[PDB]
Nucleic acid binder design. Structure first.
Lengths: 621, 388, 656
RNA sequence: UGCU
RNA sequence: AGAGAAAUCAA
């Protein structure tokens, strides 16, 4: 695939990127034919001028924009696929060169442009010979003679006449060396052709078994699961403060505070109260950044990686073996129901203040009324306050966890009531975080207000007595490392309101659709399988419990929870089917409860949902 | 014009600075246009970015750095408050500029506040999603000629005759009228985006309880749902027979891709002799008809007018040209619709069949040209066509 | 869970979305991926035989097996060749109209495919830098490598790209000169072409155990793209495909259709167990060969449709970083075969830091053509039901007249998918006999109602472009969620309110911060949503822009309207068809040898963008190079100008 | 250093 | 310490 001697380097370089030569049949020959035609056009238009402008304007292998510009000035327009090769300005005609094997079959292609016929040996058709000058014919005959001697030197004459007869043939050929590489790891060729007669064998399979009864999940036995979450959830109280900014409230709390330890946990040493008090003071002055102190190495895990590596390498006793990780199995904690009841408790404020969207149509009024009533239902609840606390804490922690600071940062958890009083829900304490990925864990020191102390529920939280203005509240303190993605997704924890809103909306809309009337204060009876018996609560209480359960499911989301829910969707569908007096059949090795039981290890709400499943009628008959 | 000087200077700078990249092929533009090492989403780094001391990256201009202890310029970088300062105590523009800067949005808002919504009713109606045109368009344009229409609107001089042929006329003129101010005020890319959004027919799956008109489909997320529904308020040419010896037949041809599957696509043709007066906008005239051939055509058209689509309308009327009514297009037609469209696309891309059917004459007195244009100079003219 | 199963006024399937984990962190994968990929590679060999015989199983080139060797109890890896021939023949004779579309695509659309579309993909492993790179960089590196080695200029079409890839493998020695003189041999280039770069599938929900994915190298991406567009063209026209192009309307029609009362209905909905570690590429090669041979396609088409799978039969999966080994409390990662482990049968198939695997597919590749292999098995005389399958998820509607025939067809359906290795999951497939209650993809079906249930919650969080555009994307996402049936009136309005509140917060328009106090003593009245003003968008008004709505409602008046839409403003100067350029349409403020190339290509793109208005509308297509194209366009625009001849000629003189 |  | 879950973060 090299340049022919009779073709100039400029012509070859121009012709390189004009068409896909490599993927066409008889490549490197069609390109040579096109180069022949272009060279013929150039020789015909060789330094010839007329009326002060070149007589012949070649169009082959030229930009379409400038071709259209030239044609527009000449009061003629040409199509893309049938454009002439050159135009004769002297007599206002267009000519396209066409190499042919025989000159007898002139065959005028079209009336748009007269053609020019040339054979492979040099002689031209009578029309194109008598329309052009003798020097042009002599030059073309010489060029064709050199082309023909080149062709017969490399004996492509049949190939040349095939390209002349044809127009284009797409192809794609795989070489012989690539074929050997391709067929190294297969029993067939590039074109498979097994010597087997097509047929579908008759295989004897097993039989399908009916799900006579719904499966029973396997409750796990072990120590009760502690409360493993960023914040305290339902046990979260707040301290009222005079109206003002965060700094004023923090200064007031620091001025009026007496901290004494009630319960000390080995996980969180009681000595980390000094750094928290220092952070209170520093935020009171105004700068929520402090230099590192002595009581911070055991508080934010400074140099723990190197220390633990040295401790592990100190012994270095044993033999290399595959790393086996064991996940401890835990039972259902007693406090899940306590949290569910407390999260449903009624508060005084609304705790859900969202700006009402505008109303322009009748449909907008219905949606806004439904949203307002839903917010009224689930607003004056403890769970809404806990959601607001979680949102504020996560956002304040995330906003200060974007740089690579090596100093302690303070992010108080302060909310403001409609009156204006500050509300101290707790405080997040950033540590030195040289974060590099969203999955990296940044040290935190969560200090928050309890409402009740339970050692079994909080084995790691240290409880300190806090006295503020003749009122005493507890104070939690836990060391926690928490990642960027988790903080980001908890900064939008208000999204959890959607699912109970969807349930309430569908109930109300179904009630309004049974008849033809919108009521907006429908409170139907929702029959549920509570404690085995079929007792039904109200819609308002059901949505309230649904929100609390979803909030617990959100802050306690993990791969176990995801697998549990994903594999129990089908069991819920089967339960609905059996409720509708329907038969459920299963294949041979069908153990749907196995896919669920493997996801129940130590997650509290997973175990609670498992018990709720195993608190239901088994056979629906 | 200094713009040409700037273009030349920038081209020289690009050639000198980036020799290897400039030596790439022009078709590689579709590859290196999106060349970037940027790798989720910046939604995470927004609350911190907005609260940075100098979030706004402004250009050197006449902005007060300190107003009422503002500190809004560091010299560039700007404070987050300077977008708000440009809403009061700033510089204003002409009413034509503000009217033309947004046009499609004004149309969408105007349509919304122009419909008399009925009374919302609730029931057990179940919606089924169907593909309907997303938003109303200024003209009915197929999803294949939109790029060519845009090329004709924005760059008429950089185009090809084929692109003009496969472009919806009429919509181009209205688009030019509505976008002459918009192109002047906004950027070229934004202008192209507004133009396509005006003319694009993007079929999008939407809820459907009743047949959605293009107007209704735009606002459908609230009109219908699972529990409620509120109730709202040949091509262009025509033909007329004058003298038909026998009436038009309804013969149909069946295509057998396999012995088990067949399709029945009927083609309508005359018999004997006929004369039909075809009318299409400025084009008017009557042509003699044969059993399947054409004897004479009389056309009254404006000078230098495109006369391709009217003749394609004529060919379909009598099933005159063979390769689109008996001989398939190389593939089995699934239905009559795409057969109707594919005929008018294949025979508009190339019109060799018409020229072969009617033939070519060597004289220049015949008005119509092989390129299907009225009264233009040419090296040859199609025969058996005259004027009234 | 007793709260999620109501007994009155609402169906349990209606409360199915409560069984989701929209809020809360999604699971993320930690540490090395070697263990996961090794357990993914062992499965095709463990299930090949009825009893585990991996040591002998590591000698099979083609997964063809005998009917008596198919494990009817547990998973079975492999296929039956004659079964594949007969099933492909049946799937071609039936649905024949859908096969002429493939013929039209091959004869017309296939040669017109451009290799520039390969840049609109995922991150690609580059055999130059041995590092994951964005698709455009990998594509341009591969193109430059081919041009340097083949000594020719690659055509714009994808077929030319594949021809160049085929030709470069014929050269014994290859180089990538360009400071750098990286040298490759035929074997090294072949291994780089075969190598798949494996990575964790991060942020995946609904699974307890993490799983890995791999992406093809640029040397085979063109072939894979060709076969995948062919598979898509076939799947877009068959009623048995759960392709998103069909919109899952097929499930809606199958749910709404009636049935003769005496006929016994039934609906099987389930998952496929180990879908991507049971299928053998040779089955797809054979099916494609049958499809293109019964269509009368040319021989070169049939050849071209087998490189993508024959390279995959020789895949060299990247193990990763190694397996974790511990002495005491210290952890060290070691490569496979360095120490005894639970994978010692595969130490032979180790090529550096890669593992070879003839049998089995891998996640992240051949998604569309896997569906075709799962749909040819349906076309049998016994099976008279309606199948809708999308990757490892199917649904079958039985319409028998007797229960015994129902179970016979159910077992026939179970067995026919095992003839090619689909291996439906026994523990995940559930059949409901009386009528239709089931799930497909994320949809849930009950009687005549099929409702979409989201897998991941719509992110009601502001983006990072600018408030004017950010509101547009937020409202568009909410509108899309409502339009798919996942949301409704109240849920949609609540989502809008939550998004609006977060959007106001994220631009310092809420509470008492620097911005709002800056607007206090300066008398800057808030007129936009991002300024903390009252919201203007309603539930029925997600599809209109903010500024036009406020102008129509008389909120931005005209003095402020003129000032905020000034084109000469200092700040400025699911497609987003909103956010007219205004004052608030601003932008924020944010191996090294690739950066300079980035500015070089940016300059080339900028100069092209100005002289070529047509590249904004249609893809660039013009013979020649960038330099010549720009030079000729500059000459044309100079001559097209209205200036006199002397100015034009001196401008052309300045061009150099 | 101020999202109910 | 702790976070956590089949293995990493605590530079």
């Amino acid at each position: 695939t090299d340049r022919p001697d009779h073709i100039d380097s400029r012509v070859w370089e121009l012709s390189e990127t004009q068409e896909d030569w490599i993927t066409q049949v008889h490549g490197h020959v069609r390109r040579v034919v096109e180069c022949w035609k272009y060279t013929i056009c150039c020789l015909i238009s060789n330094m010839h001028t007329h009326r002060g402008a070149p007589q012949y304007d070649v169009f082959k292998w030229q930009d379409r924009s400038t071709i259209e510009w030239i044609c527009s000035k000449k009061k003629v327009q040409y199509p893309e696929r049938d454009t002439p090769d050159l135009y004769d300005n002297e007599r206002a005609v267009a000519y396209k060169v066409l190499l042919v094997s025989d000159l007898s079959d002139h065959s005028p292609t079209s009336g748009i442009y007269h053609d020019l016929a040339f054979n492979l040996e040099g002689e031209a058709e009578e029309s194109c010979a008598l329309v052009l000058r003798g020097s042009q014919l002599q030059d073309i005959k010489g060029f064709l003679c050199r082309a023909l001697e080149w062709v017969v030197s490399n004996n492509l004459t049949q190939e040349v006449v095939e390209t002349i007869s044809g127009e284009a043939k797409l192809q794609f050929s795989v070489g012989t060396t690539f074929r050997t590489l391709l067929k190294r790891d297969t029993d067939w060729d590039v074109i498979p052709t097994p010597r087997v007669e097509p047929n579908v064998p008759r295989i004897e399979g097993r039989r399908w078994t009916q799900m006579k009864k719904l499966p029973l999940l396997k409750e796990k036995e072990g120590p009760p699961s502690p409360w493993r979450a960023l914040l305290l959830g339902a046990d979260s109280e707040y301290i009222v403060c005079p109206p003002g900014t965060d700094q004023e409230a923090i200064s007031w709390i620091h001025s009026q505070s007496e901290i004494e330890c009630i319960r000390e946990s080995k996980s969180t040493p009681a000595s980390v109260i000094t750094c928290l008090t220092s952070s209170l003071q520093s935020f009171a002055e105004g700068n929520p950044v402090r230099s590192r102190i002595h009581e911070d190495i055991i508080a934010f895990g400074i140099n723990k990686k190197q220390e633990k590596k040295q401790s592990a390498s100190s012994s270095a006793s044993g033999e290399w073996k595959r790393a086996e990780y064991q996940v401890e199995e835990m039972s259902l904690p007693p406090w899940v129901e306590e949290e569910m009841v407390l999260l449903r408790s009624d508060q005084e404020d609304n705790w859900i203040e969202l700006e009402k969207n505008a109303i322009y149509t009748e449909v907008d009024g219905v949606a806004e009324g439904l949203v307002d009533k839903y917010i009224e239902i689930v607003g004056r609840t403890k769970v809404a306050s806990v959601i607001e606390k979680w949102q504020i804490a996560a956002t304040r922690t995330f906003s200060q966890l974007h740089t690579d600071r090596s100093r302690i940062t303070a992010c108080p958890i302060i909310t403001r009531d409609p009156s204006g009083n500050c509300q101290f829900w707790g405080m997040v304490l950033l540590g030195p975080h040289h974060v590099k990925r969203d999955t990296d864990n940044a040290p935190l020191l969560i200090a928050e207000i309890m409402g009740e102390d339970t050692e079994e529920k909080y084995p790691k939280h240290s409880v300190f007595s806090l006295k503020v203005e003749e009122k005493q509240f507890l104070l939690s303190l836990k060391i926690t490392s928490f990642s960027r993605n988790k903080l980001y997704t908890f900064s939008n924890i208000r999204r959890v309101l959607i699912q109970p809103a969807s349930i309430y909306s569908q109930v109300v809309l179904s009630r309004a659709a049974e008849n033809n009337s919108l009521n907006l204060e429908v409170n139907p009876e929702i029959q549920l399988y509570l404690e085995g018996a079929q007792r039904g609560m109200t819609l308002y209480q059901w949505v309230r419990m649904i929100l609390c359960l979803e909030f617990l499911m959100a802050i306690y989301n993990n791969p176990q929870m995801e697998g549990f829910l994903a594999n129990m969707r089908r069991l819920h569908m089967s339960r609905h089917a059996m409720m509708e007096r329907r038969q459920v059949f299963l294949p041979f090795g069908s153990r749907p409860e196995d896919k669920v039981n493997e996801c129940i290890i130590n997650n509290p709400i997973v175990a609670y949902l498992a018990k709720g499943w195993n608190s239901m009628p088994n056979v629906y008959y | 014009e200094c713009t040409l000087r700037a273009l030349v200077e920038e081209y020289n700078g690009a050639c000198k600075e980036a020799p290897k990249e400039m030596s790439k092929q022009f078709t590689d533009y579709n590859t290196f246009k999106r060349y970037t090492t940027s790798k989720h989403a910046p939604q995470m780094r927004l609350v911190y970015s907005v609260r940075k001391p100098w979030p706004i990256s402004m250009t050197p201009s006449k902005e007060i750095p300190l107003v009422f202890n503002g500190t809004k310029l560091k010299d560039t970088r700007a404070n987050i408050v300077v977008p708000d300062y440009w809403s009061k105590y700033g510089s204003q523009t002409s009413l034509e500029v503000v009217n033309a800067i947004l046009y499609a949005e004004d149309l969408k808002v105007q349509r919304f506040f122009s419909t008399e919504w009925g009374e919302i009713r609730y029931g057990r109606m179940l919606p089924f999603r169907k593909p309907v045109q997303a938003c109303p368009t200024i003209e009915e344009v197929n999803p294949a000629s939109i790029p060519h229409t845009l090329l004709q609107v924005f760059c008429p001089q950089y185009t090809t005759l084929d692109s003009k042929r496969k472009a919806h006329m009429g919509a181009v003129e209205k688009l030019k009228r509505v976008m002459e101010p918009i192109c002047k005020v906004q950027t070229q890319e934004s202008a192209v985006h507004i133009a396509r959004s005006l003319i694009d027919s993007n079929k999008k799956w939407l809820p459907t309880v009743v047949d959605h008109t293009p107007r209704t489909a735009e606002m459908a997320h609230f009109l219908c749902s699972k529990y409620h529904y509120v109730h709202t308020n040949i091509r262009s040419t025509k033909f007329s027979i004058l003298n038909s010896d026998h009436p038009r037949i309804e013969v149909k041809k069946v295509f057998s891709l396999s012995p088990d599957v067949q399709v029945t696509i009927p083609y309508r043709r005359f018999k004997g002799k006929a004369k039909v007066y075809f009318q299409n906008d400025q084009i008017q005239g009557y042509f003699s008809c044969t059993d399947r051939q054409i004897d004479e055509i009389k056309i009254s058209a404006p000078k230098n007018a495109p006369l391709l689509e009217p003749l394609l309308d004529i060919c379909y009327y009598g099933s005159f040209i063979e390769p689109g009514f008996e001989q398939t297009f190389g593939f089995y037609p699934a239905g009559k619709r795409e057969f109707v469209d594919s005929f008018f696309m294949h025979h508009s891309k190339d019109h060799k069949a018409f020229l072969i059917h009617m033939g070519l004459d060597k004289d220049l007195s015949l008005p119509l040209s092989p390129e299907l244009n009225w009264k233009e100079p040419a090296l040859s003219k199609v025969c058996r066509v005259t004027e009234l | 869970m007793n709260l999620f199963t109501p007994l009155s006024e609402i169906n349990p399937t209606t409360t199915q979305e409560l069984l989701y984990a929209y809020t809360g962190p999604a699971p993320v994968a930690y540490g090395t991926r070697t263990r996961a990929v090794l357990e993914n590679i062992i499965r095709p060999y463990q299930y090949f035989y009825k009893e585990p015989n991996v040591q002998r199983a590591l000698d099979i080139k083609t997964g063809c097996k005998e009917p008596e060797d198919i494990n009817v109890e547990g998973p079975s890896s492999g296929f039956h060749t004659a079964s594949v021939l007969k099933l492909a023949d049946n799937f071609f004779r039936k649905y024949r109209p859908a096969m002429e579309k493939l013929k039209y695509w091959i004869l017309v659309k296939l040669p017109k495919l451009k290799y520039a579309e390969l840049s609109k993909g995922r991150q690609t492993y580059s055999f130059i830098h041995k590092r994951n790179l964005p698709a455009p960089i990998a594509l341009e590196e591969t193109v430059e490598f081919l041009e340097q080695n083949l000594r020719r200029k690659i055509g714009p079409t994808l077929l030319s790209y594949c021809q160049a890839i085929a030709d470069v493998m014929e050269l014994d020695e290859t180089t990538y000169e360009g400071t750098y003189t990286i040298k490759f041999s035929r074997e090294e280039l072949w291994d780089q072409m075969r190598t798949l770069n494996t990575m964790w599938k991060h942020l995946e929900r609904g699974r307890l155990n993490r799983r890995t994915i791999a992406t093809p190298s640029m040397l085979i991406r063109g072939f894979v793209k060709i076969v995948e567009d062919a598979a898509k063209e076939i799947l877009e026209n068959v009623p048995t495909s759960g392709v998103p192009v069909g919109g899952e309307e097929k499930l809606a029609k199958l749910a709404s259709k009636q049935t003769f009362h005496t006929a016994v209905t039934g609906e099987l909905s389930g998952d496929q167990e180990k879908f991507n570690e049971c299928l053998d590429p040779d089955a797809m090669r054979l099916m494609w060969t049958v499809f293109l041979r019964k269509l009368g396609c040319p021989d070169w088409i049939m050849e071209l449709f087998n490189i993508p799978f024959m390279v995959f039969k020789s895949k060299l999966a990247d193990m990763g970083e190694g397996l974790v080994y511990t002495k005491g409390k210290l952890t060290d990662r070691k490569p496979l075969g360095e120490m005894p482990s639970e994978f010692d049968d595969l130490v032979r198939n180790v090529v550096g830091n890669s593992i070879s695997c003839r049998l089995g597919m891998f996640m992240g590749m051949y998604n569309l053509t896997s569906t075709l292999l799962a749909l040819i098995s349906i076309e049998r005389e016994e099976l008279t039901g309606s199948h809708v399958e999308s990757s490892d998820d199917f649904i079958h509607f039985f319409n028998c007249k007797t229960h015994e025939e129902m179970f016979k067809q159910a077992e026939t359906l179970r067995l026919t998918l095992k003839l090619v290795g689909i291996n439906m999951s026994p523990s995940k497939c559930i059949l409901i006999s009386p009528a239709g209650i089931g799930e497909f993809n994320s949809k849930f079906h009950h009687r005549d109602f099929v409702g979409n249930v989201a897998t991941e919650l719509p992110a009601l969080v502001p983006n990072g472009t600018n408030p004017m555009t950010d509101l547009a994307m937020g409202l568009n996402v909410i509108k899309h969620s409502v339009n798919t049936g996942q949301m409704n009136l109240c849920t949609g309005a609540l989502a809008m309110r939550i998004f609006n509140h977060a959007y106001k917060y994220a631009y310092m328009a809420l509470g008492v911060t620097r911005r709002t106090r800056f607007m206090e003593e300066n008398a800057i009245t808030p007129l936009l949503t991002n300024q903390g003003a009252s919201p203007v968008h309603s539930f029925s008004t997600m599809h209109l822009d903010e500024v036009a709505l406020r102008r129509h409602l008389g909120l931005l008046d005209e003095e402020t309207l003129r000032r905020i839409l000034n084109p000469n403003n200092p700040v400025t100067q699911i497609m987003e068809d909103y956010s007219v350029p205004s004052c608030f349409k601003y932008t924020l403020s944010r191996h090294k040898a690739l950066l300079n190339k980035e500015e070089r290509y940016q300059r080339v793109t900028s100069i092209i963008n100005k002289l070529f208005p047509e590249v904004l509308i249609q893809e660039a297509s013009a013979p020649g190079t960038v330099r010549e194209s720009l030079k000729r366009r500059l000459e044309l625009v100079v001559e097209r100008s209205d200036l006199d001849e002397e100015r034009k000629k001196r401008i052309l003189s300045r061009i150099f």
